[PDB]
Design a protein around this nucleic acid. Structure first.
Lengths: 203, 148, 193, 52, 99
RNA sequence: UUGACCUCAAAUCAGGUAGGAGUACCCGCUGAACUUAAGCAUAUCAAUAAGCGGAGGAAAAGAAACCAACCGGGAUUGCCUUAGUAACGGCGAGUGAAGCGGCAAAAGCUCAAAUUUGAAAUCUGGUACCUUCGGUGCCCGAGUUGUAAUUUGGAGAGGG
RNA sequence: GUUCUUUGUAAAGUGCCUUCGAAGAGUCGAGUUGUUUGGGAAUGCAGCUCUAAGUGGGUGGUAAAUUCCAUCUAAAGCUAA
C-alpha cells in the first residue's frame, strides 16, 4: 500500500522536497480565484481518510481565507461602553479559519453537502484549505447505504451549524471534566442550570 | 390565606403600617449585603463574626465521598442487631457464640467510645475505632476486626 | 439591608430567572404517557420481558463500595464462560459491555451463575414460526433480582490475638507517611564506600 | 403559574384523618348532624350482604 | 498488588481473589510494525533533515548534548520530547561518520 | 498529419438541486447598556437582549485519547440529589459546577490504514423491454491518482 | 394463519496450533495574545509563532525535574428512546 508512504511523507513539512512543492503550490493557488473547483485532491491519502471516495458525486473545492485576528467594526474605534469592552485590535473570532473556509464553500455550492476539510498550504496573508463535498441528489450517494445518511435533511449545512470536524472542535464538544461547560451544548447546559425547577409538591 | 394578613387590617390607614416620617422607599440602605464594611459594620460584627477574610488552605476538586465516615457511638451498638435476637444475646452472654456486628453494612465508618455497653462479648467489624472505644469493647470480652 | 439577626442568605435571583421557570404541571400527565408508552411497547415487542438482563456489579467509591448494583453488560469474558457468543447473546436479551473487565472472582462467578439461571428460564422460539406462546412476564429484573452477598455469619467465637485494633491503624498510617523518606535513608547510606 | 397549588401532607397525618373519618361513620350523632336522613334505619354502621 | 485488608496503609482495601484478565488489543498502539519501521526509515532517507534538525546535529558535535537539549526544548513542546529527539539525532550521526 | 492525455471553458445541452417564509422549542456566530456594588473603573446584569447564519418534529449529544484511586465504574440525554457545596471574585457586591448514588429511557456501530492481482469482481447515465419508489439486457462513461468484497482494536487477518 | 418460489458445491458462527497484527500531522503538544470558565502558575476556544512521537500519546484539578503506577486510544464518521 502506497498510502502509508505518503502519510509519513506529509509529516515532513519542513523537508526540502516538501517546502519546494509548498512554495510552488502557494503561487499557483494564489493566481486562481478565492473559491475554485479542484479537479483532484492535492493529498489523496488525507482526503480518503476523511470520507472522500473516488467516484461521481464527490467534489473537491479549494478555498483560501485571510489570516489574522478579527477587527471589531466599531467605526473610528469607539465602542460606547465600559473600558473592559474597548478592545478592537485583539479579538480572536472563536470560530476557526478552517470553519470559515467551509462556510464560504457551502454558500457557493448550496446544492452540495460539506463532509470535511483539511489544510493544504498557507502563507502570511492566506491560509489554503480543501473541502470535501458530496452530492445528496446523485444516485450513487442516494444508493450505497454507507453514504446515504447525508441525504436525510437534518444534515443541511453542517458547517453552518458546527457539525463538521472543525465545527465540533470550535464548540469544544468532547468528554471529560475539561469540557464540563461545553459537552452537550453551551447554551443548553447554561439554560439547564439557570432554570428554576418547581414541582406540584414543592421540595 | 390573604384574609388573615395585616394588609386587610390596614385598610383605611394612610401609611399602611409604614409610618408618615419614614415614608417607605425602594431601598433606603442598599441592596442585598450592601455596605457590610461601611454602614452595616455594627451589624456585621455583633451577630456575624468572621464573615470577611480567609483562614484555611484551598482544596481543588473536593469530593465529599472521600471524607465519608459516619460515626457510631458505644451508646447503642445494638440497634444494628435486630430486636428479636437482641434479648437472646443479652441474657446469654458467653463466648464462642458472640454476635458479629458489621457496622460498615449499617452505614458507619468509625466507632466512638461515648456510651457504656453491657458485659457481653461482642465481635465488631469496623473500618475505624477510637482508642478507648476498643478498651471498653475488650473489657467486655469482645474484639474488633478491622475491615476495608 | 442588613439588620435583625438572620443567617446570611445566598439567593441567586439577580438574572432574568422569571423567563426560565419550569413548573412540572405535567407530572401526572407524563406519568400516564410513560405507562402508555410502556404498554404500547410491550405489544410491539411480543412477549419479550421489556428489558434486558443485567449483571451484578460492585460500586466504586468506598461510600458505596459495600453495595452491589445492576450493571450494563455481561463482560465478554463472562459470556464465553456461560457457553454462548456475544453476538448471539444480544439477540436473547443479554446486554453486553465490551469495555469492562473481570478482576474479581466473586463478581465473576455471580455473573456466570446469573447467566446460567437465565438460559434455564427462557423459551427461545424457532425462526420457522411455530409460536408456542409463553405469555409475557413484564420484567426481567423482578425475575432475577440483585441480592447482596452474605459476607459473614451471625455468631462466631471471640478471637483475641492481642493487637489492640488501634495501634495497627496508628502504625499503618505512620509507616505510609514516613515511607518516602526512609527509602532515601536506604539510598543515602548505600552509596557509601 | 409558579404559585403553589398542591399542598404537601404528611402520609401518617393523611392516614390519621382517614381513620378518624371512618370512625365518623360510627353512631348517628355525627351522621344526623351532617345532613343525612338516617333516622328510620336499623343501625349504624350498616352492614349489608356481598350480593350488592 | 496484594491488599492488606484494612482501610488505610499502603495496600489498603479488601482482599479479593484476582483473575488477571486478558490484555486489551487497544493497549498495543505503541509498537506498530516491522513494515512501519521500514517505511519510516525510507522516508527519512528521502525527505532528509529539517532546518531545525540540522542545527541540533551541529550542536551535539560542537557544544555537546546538554546545550542541544535546551534548543530542542525551545523548539519542541515539552522537555521529554527534547530528550527523545536529541537521542534520535545521536543515532543519525552514529550512523553517518562512525562506520 | 492524425489520435490520445491533462487542465480550463462554452451551450435556452440531458436530468436535477440551492434561495424565500416560518422561527415557540434547537445548533452556532456576534454582542451591549440600564442595573447591583448605596459613588465607581475590575466585577455584576451576562457568556443575556438586539443583530446574523442553519435545521428538525424534535434538534443537539452519543458508543470514551471518560469517570475514577475504588472489593472499581462503564455511550449520550433528562429528573431527584450532590449543592448554594469544592472553587472563583476591589476574596467586596456577588458568582458557582462535577464524580459517585436513586430513577426515566436504553442500541449499538463503520470508514482510512492490506494484493481481488487467476482476472474492477464497483457505479451513474442512455436505450430496449418488463411485474415500475424498481428489475433485466445492451451501449457510452466514471474509476487503478483505487470503485467492490474482507477487516475496525471488543479485535482481526494470512495460514495449517 | 395460509400460499408460491430453493436460494447453494453460497454465506455465517464456534475449537486448537503458527505467523503477523497496518489504527487518522501544521495534528497533538509548547510559547504568547485575546476571550471565556467554579477551574484557581492559566477550564474551553481562537489568532500568531514553534512543531512531535511509535513498547508511542493523552489524562490523573498546584508550577518544575526525576522515578513508577493507574486509566483510556485523539487529531474521521453514523445512530432510536
Amino acid at each position: 500500500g502506497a498510502y502509508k508512504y505518503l502519510e509519513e511523507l506529509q509529516r515532513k513539512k519542513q523537508s526540502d522536497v516538501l517546502r519546494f512543492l509548498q512554495r510552488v503550490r502557494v503561487w499557483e493557488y494564489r493566481q486562481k480565484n478565492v473559491i475554485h473547483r479542484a479537479a483532484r485532491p492535492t493529498r489523496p491519502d488525507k482526503a480518503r481518510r476523511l470520507g472522500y471516495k473516488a467516484k461521481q458525486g464527490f467534489v473537491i473545492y479549494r478555498v483560501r481565507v485571510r489570516r489574522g485576528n478579527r477587527k471589531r467594526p466599531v467605526p473610528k474605534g469607539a465602542t460606547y461602553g465600559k473600558p473592559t469592552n474597548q478592545g478592537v485590535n485583539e479579538l480572536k473570532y472563536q470560530r476557526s479559519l478552517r470553519a470559515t473556509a467551509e462556510e464560504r464553500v457551502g454558500r457557493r455550492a448550496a446544492n452540495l453537502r460539506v463532509l470535511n476539510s483539511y489544510w493544504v498550504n498557507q502563507d502570511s496573508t492566506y491560509k489554503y484549505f480543501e473541502v470535501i463535498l458530496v452530492d445528496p441528489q446523485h444516485k450513487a450517494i442516494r444508493r450505497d447505504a454507507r453514504y446515504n445518511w447525508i441525504c436525510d435533511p437534518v444534515h443541511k449545512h453542517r458547517e453552518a451549524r458546527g457539525l463538521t470536524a472543525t465545527g465540533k472542535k470550535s464548540r469544544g464538544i468532547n468528554k471529560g471534566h475539561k469540557f464540563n461547560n461545553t459537552k452537550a451544548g453551551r447554551r443548553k447546559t447554561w439554560k439547564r442550570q439557570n432554570t428554576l425547577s418547581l414541582w406540584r409538591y414543592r421540595k | 390565606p390573604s384574609r388573615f394578613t395585616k394588609t386587610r387590617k390596614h385598610r383605611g390607614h394612610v401609611s399602611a403600617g409604614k409610618g408618615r416620617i419614614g415614608k417607605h422607599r425602594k431601598h433606603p440602605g442598599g441592596r442585598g449585603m450592601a455596605g457590610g464594611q461601611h454602614h452595616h459594620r455594627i451589624n456585621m460584627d455583633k451577630y456575624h463574626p468572621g464573615y470577611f477574610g480567609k483562614v484555611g488552605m484551598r482544596y481543588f476538586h473536593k469530593q465529599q465521598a472521600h471524607f465519608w465516615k459516619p460515626v457510631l457511638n458505644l451508646d447503642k451498638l445494638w440497634t444494628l442487631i435486630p430486636e428479636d435476637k437482641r434479648d437472646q444475646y443479652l441474657k446469654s452472654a458467653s463466648k464462642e457464640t458472640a454476635p458479629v456486628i458489621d457496622t460498615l453494612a449499617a452505614g458507619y465508618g468509625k466507632i466512638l467510645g461515648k456510651g457504656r455497653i453491657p458485659n457481653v462479648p461482642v465481635i465488631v467489624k469496623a473500618r475505624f475505632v477510637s482508642k478507648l472505644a476498643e478498651e471498653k469493647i475488650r473489657a467486655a470480652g469482645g474484639v474488633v476486626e478491622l475491615i476495608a | 439591608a442588613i439588620s435583625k439577626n438572620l443567617p446570611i442568605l445566598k439567593n441567586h435571583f439577580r438574572k432574568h430567572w422569571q423567563e426560565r421557570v419550569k413548573v412540572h404541571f405535567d407530572q401526572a400527565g407524563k406519568k400516564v404517557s410513560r405507562r402508555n408508552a410502556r404498554a404500547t411497547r410491550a405489544a410491539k415487542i411480543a412477549p419479550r420481558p421489556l428489558d434486558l438482563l443485567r449483571p451484578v456489579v460492585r460500586a466504586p467509591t468506598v461510600k458505596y463500595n459495600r453495595k452491589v448494583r445492576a450493571g450494563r453488560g455481561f463482560t465478554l469474558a463472562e459470556v464465553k464462560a456461560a457457553g454462548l457468543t456475544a453476538a448471539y447473546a444480544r439477540t436473547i436479551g443479554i446486554a453486553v459491555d465490551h469495555r469492562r473487565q473481570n478482576r474479581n472472582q466473586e463478581i465473576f462467578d455471580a455473573n456466570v451463575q446469573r447467566l446460567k439461571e437465565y438460559q434455564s428460564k427462557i423459551i427461545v422460539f424457532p425462526r420457522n414460526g411455530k409460536a408456542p406462546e409463553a405469555e409475557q412476564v413484564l420484567s426481567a429484573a423482578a425475575t432475577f433480582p440483585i441480592a447482596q452477598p452474605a459476607t459473614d455469619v451471625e455468631a462466631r467465637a471471640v478471637q483475641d490475638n492481642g493487637e489492640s485494633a488501634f495501634r495497627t491503624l496508628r502504625l499503618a498510617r505512620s509507616e505510609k507517611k514516613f515511607r518516602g523518606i526512609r527509602e532515601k535513608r536506604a539510598r543515602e547510606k548505600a552509596e557509601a564506600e | 403559574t409558579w404559585r403553589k397549588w398542591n399542598v404537601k401532607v404528611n402520609h401518617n397525618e393523611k392516614r390519621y384523618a382517614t381513620a378518624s373519618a371512618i370512625a365518623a361513620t360510627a353512631v348517628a350523632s355525627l351522621v344526623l348532624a351532617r345532613g343525612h336522613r338516617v333516622e328510620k334505619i336499623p343501625e349504624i354502621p350498616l352492614v349489608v350482604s356481598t350480593d350488592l | 498488588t496484594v491488599k492488606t485488608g484494612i482501610a488505610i496503609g499502603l495496600n489498603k482495601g479488601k482482599k479479593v481473589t484476582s483473575m488477571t484478565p486478558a490484555p486489551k488489543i487497544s493497549y498495543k498502539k505503541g509498537a506498530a510494525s516491522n513494515r512501519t519501521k521500514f517505511v519510516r526509515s525510507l522516508v527519512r532517507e528521502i525527505a532528509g533533515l529539517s532546518p531545525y534538525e540540522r542545527r541540533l546535529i551541529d550542536l551535539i558535535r560542537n557544544s555537546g548534548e546538554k546545550r542541544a537539549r535546551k534548543v530542542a526544548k525551545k523548539r519542541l513542546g515539552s522537555f521529554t520530547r527534547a530528550k527523545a529527539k536529541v537521542e534520535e539525532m545521536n543515532n543519525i550521526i552514529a550512523a553517518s561518520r562512525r562506520h
